[PDB]
């Protein structure tokens, strides 16, 4: 109610290859057991080249199948959030043939590609809005990952071109009864020069969307069981909301998982409990969506190995100890009062547009992450503001902030790694 709990839905039979040969009875079983765990929403992932296999030709059956999965979620009392441009899923890119090889193009800056993306967003929104359970459209999953290094076939863009891309697409996703959003990996906050920016994340679309993954150096550098690692989803929420103009703008922890390349298997339920409990201490947090509902079938290869076991349900569809934990967290917290305000803040220097001067210091083991972590471990409950708020006595009073901590001696993120596997 006050806090949303849900899952990123990975079809148990077929994964996202289910869209080619869906087992609708198994999809209904998946969604029923998600609902029985006490989840109130799912996030769903169609595949872009199946929806739009030619720039000007949309596969109506593929759109209808997304609508059916939304409908099935709503039969079991789940709200459904739908991402469009996949695009990127668990190390794989699914790109339309009209954007690759002989047709290599830039999905962010080519006018024809942006027009086609807008047509697909409009088509999806118009059809999915016929289901009361459809509650939001996310332009796509971690859409920034194609825009910069280390992507091997990047579609480069400036941050002004990404402003224009977001502004070209998000209005088409709007409509009565649902949200419009996009999502990014954490290079948005941690990579200097990256064209998806913290100011965009905290101003474009309806909520500030983050995906929290401690295999990015948090677990390795601070220690898997450390308080810092447990507090990282909170850190990312506090960090991402700091760059918005609206101090009350909600934050959606749209992915958080327990990756067993850096966590012990028997620790993932405790990791889940501590991570969610700390994330809830961010008063702007709107919801927590765990990655993911169901394990990735073992017979499917070339995933980074730990991805297979990120489910709350195992491959036999049996609820795992972490799933039991996450259901209990939802029962305990879905109606809780919001967190108390925070009078202690870490200050991040920003440029005129509001973006950090030094993003490299925000990542795992960077000076700003270390400073925030130090205060958080010391029980000081720090929030985060920019230098533009710190310089303005009225902005500080509006926020009830009393004590500021600046980064006196900045340094780059000593632990950060931008990929999910040493493979990459």
Residues that bind a second copy (CB under 8 A): 15, 17, 20-21, 49-50, 53-57, 59-62, 91-95, 97-98, 100-104, 151-153, 297, 299-302, 424
Q: Give the CA distances from residue 346 to residues 108, 170, 273, 405, 411, in Å, rounded to whole numbers and listed in that order.
A: 34, 31, 26, 5, 15
Whether the CB-CB separation of 223 and 237 falls below 8 Å is answered with no
What tokens appear for 304 in the block?
Answer: 């980074």
CB 41 within 8 A of CB 135: yes
Strands 88-89 and 92-93: antiparallel
Output 61 or 409, the one with its CB closest to a second copy: 61
Region of residue 213 (left: phi > 0; alpha: psi -120 to 50; beta: else)? beta
Which residue's CB is nearer to a second copy, number 1 or number 299? 299
Write down the least CB distance from residue 18 to a second copy, Å.
10
CB count within 10 Å of CB 156 equals 14
> Of 299 and 393, which CB lies nearer to a second copy in the complex structure?
299
CB of 136 to a second copy, least distance (A): 26
Distance in Å, CB of 16 to a second copy, minimum = 9
Provide, rounded to whole angstroms, the least separation between the CB of residue 369 and a second copy.
Answer: 26
Task: Find, among 169, 271, 211, the residue nearest to 43 by Cα.
Answer: 211
Nearest to 125 by CA among 92, 169, 167: 169
Shortest Cβ distance from residue 297 to a second copy (Å)?
7
- The residue among 95 and 133 lying less far from a second copy, judged by its C-beta, is 95
Q: Which residue, 271 or 306, is less far from a second copy as judged by CB? A: 306
Distance of closest approach, residue 24 Cβ to a second copy, in angstroms: 13
Residue closer to a second copy (CB basis): 35 or 59: 59
Q: How far is the CB of 99 from a second copy (least distance, A)?
A: 10
Of 59, 70, 69, the closest CA to residue 24 belongs to 69
C-alpha–C-alpha distance, residues 128 and 367, integer Å? 44
User: Could you tell me if 199 and 205 are in contact, meaning their C-beta atoms sit under 8 angstroms apart?
Assistant: no
What secondary structure letter does DSSP report for 342? -
- DSSP letter, residue 204: S
Nearer to a second copy, 2 or 60 (CB): 60
- Shortest CB 150 distance to a second copy, Å: 9
**Pairing outcome for strands 134-138 and 92-93:** unpaired
Nearer to a second copy by C-beta: 108 or 286?
Answer: 108
d(CA 228, CA 236): 12
Segment holding 404, helix H or strand E: strand 403-406
């Amino acid at each position: 109610s006050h806090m949303k709990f849900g899952v990123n839905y990975t079809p148990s039979h077929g994964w996202f290859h289910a869209w080619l040969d869906p087992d609708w009875d198994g999809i209904d079983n998946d969604l029923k057991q998600i609902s029985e765990l006490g989840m109130d929403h799912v996030r769903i992932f169609p595949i872009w080249p199946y929806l739009q296999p030619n720039r000007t030709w949309i596969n109506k059956k593929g759109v209808a199948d997304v609508r059916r999965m939304v409908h099935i979620a709503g039969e079991h009392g789940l709200d459904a959030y739908v991402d469009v441009f996949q695009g990127h899923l668990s190390s794989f890119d699914f790109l339309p043939s009209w954007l690759v090889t002989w047709h290599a193009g830039n999905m962010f800056t080519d006018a024809d590609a942006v027009a086609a993306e807008r047509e697909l967003v409009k088509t999806m929104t118009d059809e999915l809005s016929k289901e009361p359970a459809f509650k939001g459209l996310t332009l796509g999953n971690e859409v920034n990952q194609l825009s910069d290094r280390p992507h091997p076939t990047k579609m480069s863009a400036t941050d002004r071109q990404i402003d224009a891309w977001l502004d070209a697409l998000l209005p088409t996703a709007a409509g009565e009864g649902h949200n419009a959003l996009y999502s990014v990996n954490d290079g948005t906050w941690f990579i200097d020069g990256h064209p998806f920016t913290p100011v965009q994340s905290a101003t474009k679309g309806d909520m500030t969307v983050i995906h929290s993954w401690v295999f990015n150096g948090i677990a390795q550098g601070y220690g898997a069981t450390s308080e810092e690692c447990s507090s990282y989803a909170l850190y990312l929420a506090e960090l991402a909301k700091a760059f918005g103009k609206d101090s009350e703008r909600p934050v959606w922890l749209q992915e958080v998982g327990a990756p067993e390349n850096v966590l012990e298997t028997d620790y993932t339920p405790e990791f889940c409990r501590k991570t969610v409990e700390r994330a809830m201490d961010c008063r702007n947090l709107w919801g927590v969506t765990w990655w993911c509902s169901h394990d990735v079938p073992a017979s499917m290869e070339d995933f980074p190995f730990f991805e297979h076991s990120l489910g709350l349900f195992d491959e036999q569809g049996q609820l795992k100890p972490i799933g039991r934990t996450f259901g209990e967290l939802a029962a305990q917290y879905r109606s809780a009062l919001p967190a108390q305000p925070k009078t202690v803040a870490v200050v991040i220097d920003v440029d005129e547009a509001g973006n950090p001067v030094n993003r490299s210091a925000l990542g795992p083991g960077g000076s700003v992450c270390d400073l925030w972590m130090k205060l958080q471990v010391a029980g000081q409950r720090p929030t985060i503001i920019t230098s533009q708020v710190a310089a303005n006595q009225e902005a500080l009073a509006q926020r009830g902030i009393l004590e500021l901590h600046a980064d006196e001696h900045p340094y780059a993120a000593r632990y950060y790694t931008a990929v999910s596997d040493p493979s990459f």
